[PDB]
Design a binder for this molecule. Structure first.
Ligand SMILES: O=c1cc(-c2ccc(O)c(O)c2)oc2cc(O)cc(O)c12
Length: 326
C-alpha cells in the first residue's frame, strides 16, 4: 500500500528535510518568555499562555514532559518545515531550563474557544468554513510529506472572532516514506482509522482523512465522539456497527489481514447503518445531502478510497466557502 498523492515528496527533497535525527537545535533565551496562565495539558506536554517580554506580545509556551530526544527533534523538524503554511501553528522559538534541560516550544498565541463549548454554537455555514480551513492545513502538510496522525478537535485551535484556525500539536506527526511500516499507536482512540485498529502499518496521509471524517460526523450529528469505543478492540466494533462488516471483510481481504480471533469474535456481523439514521431534532439543521455525501466519502474502511484533502476541499459541500474566498 502506498499514498495516491504526494508519495514522492520526501524522495525528491534533500535528506536535510526529513532526516530529523540529524537536526541540531538552536536554543533561544528561556527568559524571553514568561508563563501567564496554564491553558492545557496532555500526556506529553503542559501548555501555557505566555508573554514575550521583549515585545509584550502573547505567546504559547508548550513545556515538554520527559521523552526520548528523537521525538523532540521530530516535532521541531516538522514544525520548522511547515512554519508559514496555511493554518499551521507557527513555531516561534525553542528554549530550555538551564538546570534540568527541560525543553519548551514557543508558538504564536491563538485566542481559542474549547470545542465542547464552541461547536454547539456553530451554524451550518461555520462548520463548512472551519472544516475548509482545517482541510487547507492538511493538504498543506500532506503536500510537504507530513502526516499529522492526531487530528481531533482538541488539536484544532479556533479564534472564532477572527475566524482563525490553527492545526496544533505536531508531537505525533511523521514524515511519509513509500513502503514504510509505521507505529499504529497514534491518534486518539475515537479518531483512529481502521488501518490502526487492524494493524495495517503501511498507512499514509489518508489516516488524517479518517480522523477528519470522525470529527466532522461528531459536528454534524452532534454526537461527540462519534465512534465511542472504550478500548481499541471496542473502537473497531463501534465502527463496524455503523459501516457494516461486509465492507470490513472486503477491506481485510484486499490487504491480506486477518483479525485476532478475540477481535473477530467481538466485531461479529453487522448490517450497514445508513447515515440518515443518525439525524434527530437536535442535529437536523446541520445534516444535508451534501454533508452526508462528503462524510460518506471520508469514512471508508479502505484508506485508498477516502478523499484526499485536496479533493475534499473541492466537494460541493464547500461551494459557498470557496465563493466567499473567490
Ligand atoms: O493557542 C494555543 C496553542 C496551543 C498549542 C500550540 C502548539 C502545540 O504544539 C500545542 O500542543 C498546543 O495550545 C493551546 C491550548 C489551549 O487550551 C488554548 C490555546 O489557546 C492554545
Amino acid at each position: 500500500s502506498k499514498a495516491r498523492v504526494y508519495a514522492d515528496v520526501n524522495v525528491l527533497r534533500p535528506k536535510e528535510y526529513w532526516d530529523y535525527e540529524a537536526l541540531t537545535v538552536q536554543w533561544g533565551e528561556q527568559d524571553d518568555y514568561e508563563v501567564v496562565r496554564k491553558v492545557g495539558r496532555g500526556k506529553y506536554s503542559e501548555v501555557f499562555e505566555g508573554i514575550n517580554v521583549n515585545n509584550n506580545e502573547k505567546c504559547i509556551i508548550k513545556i515538554l514532559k520527559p521523552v526520548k530526544k528523537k521525538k523532540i527533534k521530530r516535532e521541531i523538524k516538522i514544525l520548522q518545515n511547515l512554519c508559514g503554511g496555511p493554518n499551521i501553528v507557527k513555531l516561534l522559538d525553542i528554549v530550555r531550563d538551564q538546570h534540568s534541560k527541560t525543553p519548551s516550544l514557543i508558538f504564536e498565541y491563538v485566542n481559542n474557544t474549547d470545542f465542547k463549548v464552541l461547536y454547539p454554537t456553530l451554524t451550518d455555514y461555520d462548520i463548512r468554513y472551519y472544516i475548509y480551513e482545517l482541510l487547507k492545513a492538511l493538504d498543506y502538510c500532506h503536500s510537504q510529506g507530513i502526516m499529522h496522525r492526531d487530528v481531533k478537535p482538541h488539536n484544532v485551535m479556533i479564534d472564532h472572532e477572527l475566524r482563525k484556525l490553527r492545526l496544533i500539536d505536531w508531537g505525533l506527526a511523521e514524515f511519509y516514506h513509500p513502503g514504510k511500516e509505521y507505529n499504529v499507536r497514534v491518534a486518539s482512540r475515537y479518531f483512529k482509522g481502521p488501518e490502526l485498529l487492524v494493524d495495517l502499518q503501511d498507512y499514509d496521509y489518508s489516516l488524517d482523512m479518517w480522523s477528519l471524517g470522525c470529527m466532522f460526523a461528531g459536528m454534524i450529528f452532534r454526537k461527540e465522539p462519534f465512534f465511542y469505543g472504550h478500548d481499541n478492540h471496542d473502537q473497531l466494533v463501534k465502527i463496524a456497527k455503523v459501516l457494516g462488516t461486509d465492507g470490513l471483510n472486503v477491506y481485510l481481504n484486499k490487504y491480506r489481514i486477518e483479525l485476532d480471533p478475540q477481535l473477530e469474535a467481538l466485531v461479529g456481523r453487522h448490517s450497514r447503518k445508513p447515515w440518515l439514521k443518525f439525524m434527530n431534532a437536535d442535529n437536523q439543521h446541520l445534516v444535508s445531502p451534501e454533508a452526508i455525501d462528503f462524510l460518506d466519502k471520508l469514512l471508508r474502511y479502505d484508506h485508498q478510497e477516502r478523499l484526499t484533502a485536496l479533493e475534499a476541499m473541492t466537494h460541493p459541500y464547500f461551494q459557498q466557502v470557496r465563493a466567499a474566498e473567490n
